[PDB]
């Protein structure tokens, strides 16, 4: 037992990280088969940053201007192309460490692990959620651009995120691995509004189930509610509306604990209306929304890769 | 910017995990050079668990009884020896994936990453602290025994923890890699007192510095304190006493922020006496004590491996 914010083991991803330098800018790239993926703003300079014309900037570049280094190994670049906000550098060697992999565009509210890297070297790994407003609350310093987020199922790495930028509010924005930003963001140095954010209701409920499984049970009450009544409360507290699809994905946790989903909603309603009264749940003094139902089941069942 | 509970990248450790089977018990082992390390309780059965005579149990075993498997490849066991609470199985092949490594016995209050494994396969990675009472608050299910904790400095993995057991209270106990338990614990199925835990004061201060660096500064106040006055408050709230050695190791964070260590102690004093008033710090509604001053500097400066 116990319940931790757990990341995926990062070894399969560590073997794909490279350094990419173009001009004076160095950031990280992802080396899969014979292609290196990285943020296209590696080709900018400080004068460019307010509104780069990336097509014009890339036209001034040739293959030999992109310096790609995998540990101490220098890679030979034999082609380059821009796809949305990512650059695809074709290299003459396939990465011998390429895992089985897929590219996925995740939905808001899903979670993934981030391997934070600088100069192509891994620094740390942590778990985080794609917020409903398509930002992430990461830990990224200058030089972390090109760090990737991912999930692992059996032997297959699903890459879902590449880091591009920090907004002036201090939250983080990036793309899928086809270079499409999550959310409204663009890769330029402008103030950019992120949506109203909300709390991921189905994840809070999953975590409350995780709490019960671990014996944190003080918040269970004598009440139930309806989906309609619960969602009136969710709206008041800026929680995402709960749908029957969410109730369905919580099915396995309801079965394990024997607590019906709408009964757990009534416990959550009471926590929202009354607070925690200085108590804690799974070591947290607020309602945690960065565990999906799948995460809770995995961590509670011991799934390996 | 941003501050996350970050684990070390786990790849160097993933390549050392094997499965060890003795009789009907399977758990994890650590394969370094030509030695496999695992918890000695792999040799027990359920009749044994209340107070195993490990010497007598091991005498009934020979090399060929220890089944050691690395993914698909079987290893050949050519010697065995019990050191404290760990078994050392000599194998005829040096692990080709052996990183540069050291065995370290850590101090309470220090942190490390855990690679949770089942059947020799990695499941997840998370960061945690050795509590002042020599337990850890992990996430471990049946079969996780032999999972290890570690730190990395440049290219060198310092192994500091091997997981052995879950106490009846749901916290976790284990050994250094010489098989010596942290704390008073023994490897038998008995209720065992862990004794009073305290909050790691120097770590809370480090995290308050992390907060200021990231722009959470609402808790800074107009007050200062003395080491003696602060420690009266520390004692009242079950915080470890702060020593000048602790103040010394906070020096770099004090210099970076311009906030004297005793001024930050007066902010913590006010938080302990008045609580957080429904506010958060770095996403948390309580005072976090699982980041060491070294952890904060590393994460805020982007140290890689
Ligand atoms: O390293 C960089 N470089 C810019 C890229 C940014 C891309 C769009 C044009 C303007 C520059 C950035 O946002 N960061 C960064 C990311 N995460 C955390 C940080 F602290 C900084
Ligand atoms: O898998 C086992 N096996 C016993 C070993 C234990 C060793 C000492 C004699 C009594 C048995 C155990 O404590 N766990 C476990 C660990 N962490 C989280 C869990 F949920 C269970």
From Swiss-Prot, chains A, B:
Location of the protein in the cell: Host cytoplasm; Host Golgi apparatus; Host nucleus
Cross-link (Glycyl lysine isopeptide (Lys-Gly) (interchain with G-Cter in ubiquitin)): 5, 90
Regulation: Inhibited by pyridone-containing alpha-ketoamides compounds 13a and 13b. In turn, alpha-ketoamide 13b (tert-butyl (1-((S)-1-(((S)-4-(benzylamino)-3,4-dioxo-1-((S)-2-oxopyrrolidin-3-yl)butan-2-yl)amino)-3-cyclopropyl-1-oxopropan-2-yl)-2-oxo-1,2-dihydropyridin-3-yl)carbamate) inhibits SARS-CoV-2 replication in human lung cells. Inhibited ex vivo by michael acceptor inhibitor N3. Inhibited ex vivo by compound 11a and 11b.
Catalytic activity of the protein: TSAVLQ-|-SGFRK-NH2 and SGVTFQ-|-GKFKK the two peptides corresponding to the two self-cleavage sites of the SARS 3C-like proteinase are the two most reactive peptide substrates. The enzyme exhibits a strong preference for substrates containing Gln at P1 position and Leu at P2 position
Coiled coil: none
Stated consequence of mutating residue 142 to A: Does not affect ability to cleave and inactivate human TRMT1
Signal peptide from the UniProt entry: none
Effect of residue 189 to A: Does not affect ability to cleave and inactivate human TRMT1
Active site: 41, 145
Residue numbers on the Cytoplasmic membrane side: 1-305
Domain of life: Viruses
Stretches assigned to the Peptidase C30 domain: 1-305
Function: Cleaves the C-terminus of replicase polyprotein at 11 sites. Recognizes substrates containing the core sequence [ILMVF]-Q-|-[SGACN]. Cleaves and inactivates human TRMT1, preventing tRNA guanine(26)-dimethylation of tRNAs. May cleave human NLRP1 in lung epithelial cells, thereby activating the NLRP1 inflammasome pathway. May cleave human GSDMD, triggering alternative GSDME-mediated epithelial cell death upon activation of the NLRP1 inflammasome, which may enhance the release interleukins 1B, 6, 16 and 18. Also able to bind an ADP-ribose-1''-phosphate (ADRP).
Complex formation: 3CL-PRO exists as monomer and homodimer. Only the homodimer shows catalytic activity. Interacts with host FBXO22; this interaction promotes the proteasomal degradation of nsp5.
Name of this chain's protein: 3C-like proteinase nsp5
Biological source species: Severe acute respiratory syndrome coronavirus 2 (2019-nCoV)
């Amino acid at each position: 037992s116990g319940f931790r914010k757990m990341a995926f083991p990062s070894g399969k991803v560590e073997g794909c990280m490279v350094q990419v330098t173009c001009g004076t800018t160095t950031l990280n790239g992802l080396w899969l088969d014979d292609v290196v993926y990285c943020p296209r703003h590696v080709i900018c300079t400080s004068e460019d940053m307010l509104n780069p014309n990336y097509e014009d900037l890339l036209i001034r570049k040739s293959n030999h201007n992109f310096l790609v280094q995998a540990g101490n190994v220098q890679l030979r670049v034999i082609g380059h192309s821009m796809q949305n906000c990512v650059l695809k550098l074709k290299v003459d060697t396939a990465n011998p460490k390429t895992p089985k992999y897929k590219f996925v565009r995740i939905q808001p509210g899903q979670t993934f692990s981030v391997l934070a890297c600088y100069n192509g070297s891994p620094s740390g790994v942590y778990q985080c959620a794609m917020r409903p407003n398509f930002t992430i609350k990461g830990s990224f310093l200058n030089g972390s651009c090109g760090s990737v987020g991912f999930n692992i199922d059996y032997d297959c790495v699903s890459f879902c995120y590449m880091h591009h930028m920090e907004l002036p509010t201090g939250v983080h924005a990036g793309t899928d691995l086809e270079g499409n930003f999550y959310g409204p963001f663009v890769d330029r140095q402008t103030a950019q509004a992120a949506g109203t954010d909300t709390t991921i209701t189905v994840n809070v409920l999953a975590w409350l189930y995780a709490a019960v499984i671990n014996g944190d049970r003080w918040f269970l009450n004598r009440f139930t509610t309806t989906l309609n009544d619960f969602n009136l409360v969710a709206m008041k507290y800026n929680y995402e509306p709960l749908t029957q699809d969410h109730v369905d994905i919580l099915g396995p946790l309801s079965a394990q604990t024997g607590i019906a989903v709408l009964d757990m909603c009534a416990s959550l309603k009471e926590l929202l209306q009354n607070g925690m009264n200085g108590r804690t749940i799974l070591g947290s003094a607020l309602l945690e929304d960065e565990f999906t139902p799948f995460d809770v089941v995995r961590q509670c069942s011991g799934v390996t890769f």
